[PDB]
Amino acid sequence: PDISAKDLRNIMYDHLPGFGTAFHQLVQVICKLGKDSNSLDIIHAEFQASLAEGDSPQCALAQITKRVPIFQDAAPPVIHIRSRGDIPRACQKSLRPVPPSPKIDRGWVCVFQLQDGKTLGLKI
Numbered sequence: 034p035d036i037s038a039k040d041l042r043n044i045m046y047d048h049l050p051g052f053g054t055a056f057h058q059l060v061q062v063i064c065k066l067g068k069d070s071n072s073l074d075i076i077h078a079e080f081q082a083s084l085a086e087g088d089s090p091q092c093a094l095a096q097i098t099k100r101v102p103i104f105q106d107a108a109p110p111v112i113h114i115r116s117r118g119d120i121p122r123a124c125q126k127s128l129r130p131v132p133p134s135p136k137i138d139r140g141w142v143c144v145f146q147l148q149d150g151k152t153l154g155l156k157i
Contacts, residue, residue, distance in 0.1 A: 036077050038068040045080060048090035053121025055157045056091050059142045062110055063097055066137075070103045095157070098138045109135055109143045109154070117153070120145060128153040 036044075045060040067076045076097055083093035098104040114120065120128065128145070131154040135141035142155040 036073055038064045038073060041067070041073050041077055041080075044077070045090065045094070048084070048093075051123055054123040055127040055142055055155055056094060057121070058124060058155055059094050059098075059157065062137070062143050063094065063104075065110065066103060066107070067101075072101060072103055076101055091157075095140075104137050107137045109137050109141045111146050112143050113146045115148045117145075117147065117151075120153075120155075124155055127156050129156050130154065 042060055042064045045064075046057065049056050049060070051057075063076060064073070067073045079097050079100055080090075080093050083096050084090060088096065117125075117128075131144055131152050132141070135144065135154055140157040142157060145153045145155065147153070
């Protein structure tokens with residue numbers, strides 16, 4: 034059965050320690066851009082191949098952003114939220130001012146856009 038965005042998310046989550054870490058958000062970001070570019074199959078295959086070579090699942094996610102062409106020179110997605118508290122506790126210390134030209138393949142997972150207009154980049 035064709036792997037869905039949700040199936041892939043759950044497969045990746047199964048391998049990650051903790052919850053709501055920056056890698057969890059990256060899984061969400063990768064699956065969304067993957068689905069929108071009909072690339073869930075190759076992303077899943079790259080993920081599995083990295084783990085089978087003995088990479089940690091965190092390193093496997095980083096390699097997807099470098100090896101799957103849709104992530105090449107891609108800006109992080111904007112994620113509209115209300116306040117900073119809407120960001121999971123485990124991501125809090127990874128939040129930074131947004132740089133000029135942040136890129137997914139440089140570790141900028143996403144940009145949180147807050148109600149009051151504040152913006153925060155999520156960095157791995």
